[PDB]
Amino acid sequence: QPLVGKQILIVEDEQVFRSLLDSWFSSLGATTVLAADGVDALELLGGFTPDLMICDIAMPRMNGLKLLEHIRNRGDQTPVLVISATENMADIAKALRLGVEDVLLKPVKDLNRLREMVFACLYPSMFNSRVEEEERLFRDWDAMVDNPAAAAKLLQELQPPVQQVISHCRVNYRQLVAADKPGLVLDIAALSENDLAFYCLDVTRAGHNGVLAALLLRALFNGLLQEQLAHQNQRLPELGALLKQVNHLLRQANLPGQFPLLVGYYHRELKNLILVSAGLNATLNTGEHQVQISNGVPLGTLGNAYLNQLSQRCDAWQCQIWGTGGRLRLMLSAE
Ligand code: BEF
Ligand SMILES: [Mg+2]
């Protein structure tokens, strides 16, 4: 019973998931207090001091964002984990502005991730993991926007190694032209045992808002992709729709600019690469063919009409990617 002595307020209006969280936390030893909505949560906070809050957004009489606004105006600094089915990017941006430890988008696929995140909240000295650092990026968002040097340093520290194994696939890159240190930013991330996604961003076009956008995208890219596949009940994503959601996130986060981006996803069981570009030039070479990708127009404007997705079958590929910020070659092999 690791969580004995620790108090958790669960603010959730839907019965199945609230009972699920209540049972799971109680089995681990936590004292759980249940709130139907934001008003009920405030009344319960009149007589409970939680060590952690789990908070849904969409709720009848007060949504979780107004509850968060009230507790943070009162100077309460209790950690909050947001767990919400919301597809509204304004909600995620407002949650980040108000100060939260993390934002999980329902459905929660594996309980181990939520377990480690709760444990990072309730015992931060103990669970100083990668999850700790993700939550650190989530809660320090205001501190990041108010200090450009820290944001640039963090973005450079998050640039992945040039040689990796992700989802049983071999992934390399090389910067070829980088006159800017945070120039062409890259993220590559596993989604399951057998598929991965990646993004390459050009922060130099937009200046400082590029850097912040990169940080925000690193916090949330997987979460937005996973959610799409869960909510639309699909294995293979619709990356254009994802990038439209990314547009709405960067706009609602008050990060105006032009953000040249390429996003992709690979499934090794299906041997299936999917690519789409908003603003960056790219040439793919799959072993059998060379495919030149239409660069489209950058994110940061609404109405992007050129988010047309390209699918290719391959066991391995190399993509040259470039824009005004510089040049790199990203390389994958499924064997
Ligand atoms: F009702 Be919650 F925001 F999923
Ligand atoms: Mg709800």
DSSP string for 128-139:
-SHHHHHHHHHH
In Å, how far are 48, 80, 163, 302 from 41, measured between CA atoms? 10, 13, 47, 37
| Nearest in space to 169 (alpha carbons), one of 199, 192, 201 | 192
**How many beta carbons lie within 10 A of that of residue 150, not counting itself?**
13
* Distinct helix (H) and strand (E) counts, the chain: 10, 16
Query: Does the C-beta of 195 come closer than 6 Å to ligand 1?
Result: no
Mutating to test ligand 1, I would choose from 21, 82, 106, 227 the residue with most ligand atoms within 8 A of its C-beta, which is: 106
User: Which residue intervals of the chain are DSSP H helices?
Assistant: 15-27, 38-45, 64-73, 89-98, 111-122, 130-139, 141-145, 148-157, 208-231, 239-252
Query: Does the C-beta of 63 come closer than 6 Å to ligand 1?
Result: no
* 102 CA → ligand 1 middle, Å: 15
For residue 201, the SS3 value is strand
Q: Are 253 and 300 in contact (CB under 8 A)?
A: no
Burial of 310 (0-12, 13-18, 19+ CB in 10 A): middle
Mutating to test ligand 1, I would choose from 16, 18, 56, 80 the residue with most ligand atoms within 8 A of its C-beta, which is: 56
Find the ligand nearest to 64 CA.
1
The residues, any chain, with a CB within 8 Å of residue 142's CB and separated by 6 or more, are: 97, 99
Structure tokens at 140: 């320090």
Query: Does the C-beta of 120 come closer than 6 Å to ligand 1?
Result: no
Alpha-carbon distance of 301 to 258, in angstroms, equals 7
Query: Which residues crowd ion ligand 2, with CB under 5 Å?
Result: 13, 56, 58-59
Rounded to a whole number of angstroms, the CA Rg of the chain reads: 21
Find the ligand nearest to 37 CA.
2
